[PDB]
Design a protein around this ligand. Sequence first.
Ligand SMILES: *[C@H]1O[C@H](CO)[C@H](O)[C@H](O)[C@H]1F
Ligand SMILES: *[C@H]1O[C@H](CO)[C@H](O)[C@H](O)[C@H]1F
Ligand SMILES: *[C@H]1O[C@H](CO)[C@H](O)[C@H](O)[C@H]1F
Ligand SMILES: *[C@H]1O[C@H](CO)[C@H](O)[C@H](O)[C@H]1F
Lengths: 484, 484, 489, 489
Amino acid sequence: MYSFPNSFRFGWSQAGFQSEMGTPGSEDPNTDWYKWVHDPENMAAGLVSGDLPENGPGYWGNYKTFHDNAQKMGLKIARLNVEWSRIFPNPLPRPFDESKQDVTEVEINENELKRLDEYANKDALNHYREIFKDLKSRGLYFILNMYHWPLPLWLHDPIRVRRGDFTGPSGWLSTRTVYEFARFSAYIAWKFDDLVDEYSTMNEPNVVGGLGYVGVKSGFPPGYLSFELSRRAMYNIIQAHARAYDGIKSVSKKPVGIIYANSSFQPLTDKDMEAVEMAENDNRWWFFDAIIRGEITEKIVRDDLKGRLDWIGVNYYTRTVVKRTEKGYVSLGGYGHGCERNSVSLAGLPTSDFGWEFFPEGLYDVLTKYWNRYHLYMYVTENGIADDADYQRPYYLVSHVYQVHRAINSGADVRGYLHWSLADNYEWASGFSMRFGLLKVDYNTKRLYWRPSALVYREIATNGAITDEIEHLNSVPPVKPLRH
Amino acid sequence: MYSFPNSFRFGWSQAGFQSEMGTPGSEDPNTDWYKWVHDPENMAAGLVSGDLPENGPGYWGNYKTFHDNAQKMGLKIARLNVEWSRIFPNPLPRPFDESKQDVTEVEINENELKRLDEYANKDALNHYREIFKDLKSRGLYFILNMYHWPLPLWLHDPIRVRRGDFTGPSGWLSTRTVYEFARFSAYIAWKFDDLVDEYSTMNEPNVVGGLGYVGVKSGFPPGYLSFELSRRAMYNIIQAHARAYDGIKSVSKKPVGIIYANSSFQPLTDKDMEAVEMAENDNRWWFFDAIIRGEITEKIVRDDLKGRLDWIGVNYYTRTVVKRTEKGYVSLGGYGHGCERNSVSLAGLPTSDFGWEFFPEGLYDVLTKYWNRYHLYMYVTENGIADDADYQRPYYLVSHVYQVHRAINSGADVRGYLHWSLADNYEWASGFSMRFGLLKVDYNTKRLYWRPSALVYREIATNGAITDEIEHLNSVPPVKPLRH
Amino acid sequence: MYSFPNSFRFGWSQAGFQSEMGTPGSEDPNTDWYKWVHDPENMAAGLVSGDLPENGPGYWGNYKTFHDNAQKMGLKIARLNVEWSRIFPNPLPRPQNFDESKQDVTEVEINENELKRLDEYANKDALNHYREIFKDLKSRGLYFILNMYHWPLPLWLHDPIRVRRGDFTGPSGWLSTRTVYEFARFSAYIAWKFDDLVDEYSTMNEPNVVGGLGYVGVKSGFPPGYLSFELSRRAMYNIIQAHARAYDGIKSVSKKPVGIIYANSSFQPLTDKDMEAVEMAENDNRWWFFDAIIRGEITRGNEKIVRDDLKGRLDWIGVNYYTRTVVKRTEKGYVSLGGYGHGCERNSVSLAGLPTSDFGWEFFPEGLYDVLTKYWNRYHLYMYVTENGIADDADYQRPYYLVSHVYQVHRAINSGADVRGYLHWSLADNYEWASGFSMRFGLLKVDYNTKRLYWRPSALVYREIATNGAITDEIEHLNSVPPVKPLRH
Amino acid sequence: MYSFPNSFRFGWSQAGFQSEMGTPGSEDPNTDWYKWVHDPENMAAGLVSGDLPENGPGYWGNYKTFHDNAQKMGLKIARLNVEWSRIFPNPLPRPQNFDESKQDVTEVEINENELKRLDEYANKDALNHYREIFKDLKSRGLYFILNMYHWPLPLWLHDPIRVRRGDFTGPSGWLSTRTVYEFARFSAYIAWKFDDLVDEYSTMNEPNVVGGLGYVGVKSGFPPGYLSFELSRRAMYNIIQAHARAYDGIKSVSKKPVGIIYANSSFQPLTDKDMEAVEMAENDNRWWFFDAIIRGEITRGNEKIVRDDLKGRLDWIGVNYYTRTVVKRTEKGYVSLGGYGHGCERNSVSLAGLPTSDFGWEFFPEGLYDVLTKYWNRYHLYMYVTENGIADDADYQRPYYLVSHVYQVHRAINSGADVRGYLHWSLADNYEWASGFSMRFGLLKVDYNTKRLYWRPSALVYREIATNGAITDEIEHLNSVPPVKPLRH
Ligand SMILES: *[C@H]1O[C@H](CO)[C@H](O)[C@H](O)[C@H]1F
Ligand SMILES: *[C@H]1O[C@H](CO)[C@H](O)[C@H](O)[C@H]1F
Ligand SMILES: *[C@H]1O[C@H](CO)[C@H](O)[C@H](O)[C@H]1F
Ligand SMILES: *[C@H]1O[C@H](CO)[C@H](O)[C@H](O)[C@H]1F
């Protein structure tokens, strides 16, 4: 048996854009992401799959079923987001000097919030309140995230930017987005504080800037390849996090965190340990040192950035193998996320439907490194596998949950594990083919089915432990019967 | 939902030789099969794996744990056998003309049973009583089978026979074995009737004669290749069944059946339907027409054979594809049981760790054909898959259970489904590598673990139905992620 | 036995950029493609592999060895290009009598005086080196098809990074009529200089891939990688008129045959209800182009016109072929299906159970017969198979790939098609564009460390074919699908 | 370049039973093997495949075509056997001065008079046909190694079904000294008849496989398939004395070199603690046999003796080699491991990640060097590589298999070993015993419907090797492991 503390919670995470649509009446056409996946040129180029999110799992209409299943599964925590575009589908009056690089302060008060109130979509706010009330009535502890990638179209036209036209709404390249984000977050906290337990400002901001402006083959908006603009987007996102933090704290006393995409960086040979550290600096610490210690880049300390974080949401799937170079370090293909789909890595480890390598030890690595650097408590806010057949998921689930136990045992303050995800959903540029659910979705009927891994998770959650009977699943899925 | 009748029972089947040994004190060295798998020449030839049954799962010592798990799984029926060799390890006095071909009668009465009593091993009888009492106390309905392949060494020395020496104890080639089998079965019924619900005389007698004397590459005792001796063994086994039936009925009023190995015979092309019928005649009907209608081979009717059956135990794994020949019919490799391990058949269907093709429709075929010919009620007494990883079993389980539902819906009287098996066990000449358990066995510690399929079976059994939530598993395991 | 006419030639095709560099002093940094593959942002995005052409097979210095092996192998035809950038590495003077705002280029006047001026700007070392290569070529008895263009443009004509970034103020490649004007002049110039060595001309290699991958299929990492339906059409329009202007230019200086080389797939119906889908696909991917440069039929804005300056500008068709495309009828028209043709997994099997190559291309030789006979029946121009081959480092499938496709050409001739040679892609491994060196198409293996060439068993098979002018009885079993059971699925 | 001595020969080996039948009038129903493979019970048990040798490649009638192709391929040596059963299809008179109960056969007197008597019983059509085959062989410049025995015994000497059934009252094959006596006479007889055509002799092909698979490895479906450690030893004991008696018999009539051909694997240690395990394996599978027939050392019942009638009966060693065997130390001795060598899955990869053949045999060329040099250092007798090859219908791995093993022979010579030729198994596909026709080892493919031979690309590779007496620079990259990524795992 591997027993968790009595206060530890098991649950799940999901995103508005990936899961909301699918039931008639749920359509939200007003985001950069909506426009982006319907774009004819993006489709012809294969940058997006051609699948459309309005044919999704339909959480907007069917949330009661989702919560029903989650309760039967013994889950006690959930992390969701509100979609910005649903609440403010229409542009807000211009507020503020747009040419200033830094946004050190955004003044928000009772009067300003009441003014915003008059622009807000009331049907959308009331519907979210209905969803969250039903969530809370199942005994689910609620982490509310403000941002999980789609921006209102009135703040970002991604096709214009893709085309190299910077005269329109430019998303994270514009301090106007920073300013409005802080206000949105204060506003939502103001409206929903009575239901919320903890807050997250944003989900994986590193992926937004990284795939948006460098990893353009990913088909993420706006898909404009520029090292310079990628840095600008990340700089603005950092400030937006700090201002959203201050905004929420002006209205609520509850914990405010952030959710971030992590890999476990691993040395190719024992000569590559420095390369691991440089990779950790460049992919992780630089960002967290900014919003925790105020350290940013000349290398300065910004007092408006310092201390703006109460907890860390750890998202984790797999490792990245690095080696030392003359000029620095490189990542290696054939490991981590750079493998063949439904095959084996260069290390002989099985890969998912998405080509991601099975490497649960990485999670222990990531949890304990954060803990040793910052001493902030953590949730595992995302962890899971693309696996429609359910072959690897039982092993994936138990192995990762074990590593969390390992992390706690070593002293790290980790307070919950939230699987990605409760049900299948729309996997961004990849469409519906990448199925991460504990529950399978038949997209024709929106009916949910329990994969055997869901029954395994029920065992874990109901008992607050990896029980004796399922302990063998803390191992690598046998590769011999699997595709190579 | 697929709901079964309120009286339908879900459970499991297991064999004494495959599951009993493994705990110190359980060793039974006195069978043909024990001798056969320890034989140095058999080992060097690769006819047996080299694995030894005394290193098994240890049901003899650990039966309470097995039954505990079965109860938690919601099972309500079990079929086991007593091992003949445990009860009579030593030769019994010669009774009876050994050169007579037919055994039409074996006289058994109270006095003869008391005489046998004085030869019986009392420790073994008392231990079995303890096992079965504990079984019944979990609310398990009990089918007791008399014979599941091992014969006492004093009735069969398989190495002598393998060597072409017929002067020793010759197993099913000798009417002495028939005579003693009838007495053993009456004796066991006499001892255990208060605990037993239904009886089976024997398990898969067709496999005993077929692999014993024709399919000699299987490594079944005595491994002497002879069409003639295979017929002789089957003739004696048939008579032994009829005499065991009469023996049990002299002592008990309870239902007496038999458990038999079935394939579903399928035509290669639509020109091969007659070939299917000939295959069914040669592999199935000839045997059942003997013990039900007394029809045997000149083609006669034996009154001592007629009507000796109350129910049919249907064992089923996969299909056999046949085609018409000039001289008759042939079976095709690349389908059914003749496939590559962990691969796909010639029809693109996934195969097991044993190379057996996924074909659940065959079970409906087999159930309804028996029903339409004889109108005897049936149990599915064996059905399962060699699958250590648990990749295919959830699908295999739900799909086959569905076909049973299909059979009932069409009118067939089927009263239970017994999965092969509750836990991993010693798979004959193949050893421990073929793992059929709903529970995984760690052979070092004898600890049992729940594979995700066990949690799926708990759903089925507790509800008496394939529930809505697991209904997607009534499909073929996706082949793309699997080895080809 | 499958015998070819006595005049039919077996050989190979090769491209300057893919094969020239690798030997000391061979480097040509002055193309869009060179800049494109060295670009740090393109590298970080994985648009390009990170392999660099300057570490290539070194034909620039080792051409005598290549030619030696090709002669040993009994080859009798070769098709090569001159790299524009090596001849004119620096810009030429903005031309007289030229309006950059005019959509159409109906004429480009080139005379002996203009040619003599151009000659002042040409790199003489490059010109002399190419003469040395081609002389050596002809000395082995190889018939020579000289192609003018095989993708890289001089940087002074195209800065692809600028265009990638959405900046159209600089040199914009096929988006500019200046490039059309200069291409015409370049082709006339090369013909004027090399006509004593050339047997037949091609203007261009696969223009449809340049426009298509450059401006629509941007995940392929082709320059300038700017996603735009509108700009893809403009590039294709300009490339069409460039072909016509180049044909006139070559004809002003030469009597020899002038063709074009084009990328083809065989369009195949998913079900028997999809035959119209195939015809629409053939219209959109093939006929529209050739009806323009043969029949002068084209669309400019919104109208279907005939341009007398485009009509009749083709003497022969270079058929490039690898695999099929499976199409199905839609409400809005037709779509291609993944899991067939070039959209399969690498080293696997297609949805039809046919083996795929290192590049994920489906084995489908019957498509070649389909393509050759369709071109024949529509236009009645003679053709060459100018590119056919497989990415196969291990040499598992190539022996089958080669014999089978060569059989399909024999079948095409038998049906009446005028097909005059077969040219394998390629003699030796080379630099496969954005994919780098890992895609190995050679009959000969290249060790990139030593630049040594090795005969794959397929090269020995090809020698049998070429020396005999036939698929001989002894190798005829190779006219079949590589067995799939021993291969990866 | 890897060059061989000017006297080294490249060729092939072939067996009568596997290759002769298939043409009208070639049938030879009079062997244990023939009866064994037609047996209904053996068929139903799947001990034999159900394929029949009379539908084979037809060397009996088509030998001129085989020889034609072998000469085209530049081969210069061949090793064939005569089938005993074709020469003596009927029993011979029970012999004078012979006690069937004696364990040892120390002498078999054969003189000219006895030979002339035997000649009265020999089938003359068979003898003349073999002369015609061998004359044609020699006329292509092939050096001829004639082997006396390659597994089938005349039925009058062995009824395998009777023995399978445990009935030892009939003709019992290698379990009877009568078979030893007759083999000696047969070999002297064949030498007496064919010595003008023969260059070197072998008595036997792989006697260890006959005894081993016949009496222990019974799942292999070899005759008589009677499982007995004791009878395997008796068969091997008799086969050893048969070899000695045959050597004396041949020497009574011929001056030429007389050797034996033997099945070898390379024993390899699982871990570095297993080197003694390897030596014990080499003792039990190899040295015990050769110490008997070279040094006269043997065990009879319970004692280690020297027999002067066994000592020195060998002039050369025929090395047969396919793959390795991995062994590990046990308390009781040593064991072989599955997942390496010949115990792998077909068309897959071994536990060491090395590719396996259609037969499930692991690619391990370094084992050949190990085997050749071990024999050399122990006995200092010259050797031939008499069997080496791969079951590979598609020809994917064979080009690598061939070049790599041929390299390992070059390495053996370089180290000092006297190795005088390499003979591929085999020229053409044939009947692979209990496996039937599906295991295809030919450099040439056989279509069993027409009996036509086809050159696999490996045959072209072999022609390069043989005509040059070298692995040439051009094919030297084949001295490597077939890439596993494109193959089935
Ligand atoms: C984390 O990863 C999952 C699986 O890829 C989804 O993309 C989420 O939105 C992301 F936050
Ligand atoms: C039925 O089959 C199973 C799986 O092979 C076991 O062998 C049983 O003993 C047999 F009855
Ligand atoms: C045709 O295809 C080959 C191999 O893909 C090369 O890319 C050539 O340049 C192209 F023209
Ligand atoms: C050596 O092996 C080959 C291929 O396995 C044939 O079986 C020969 O007869 C044998 F001697």
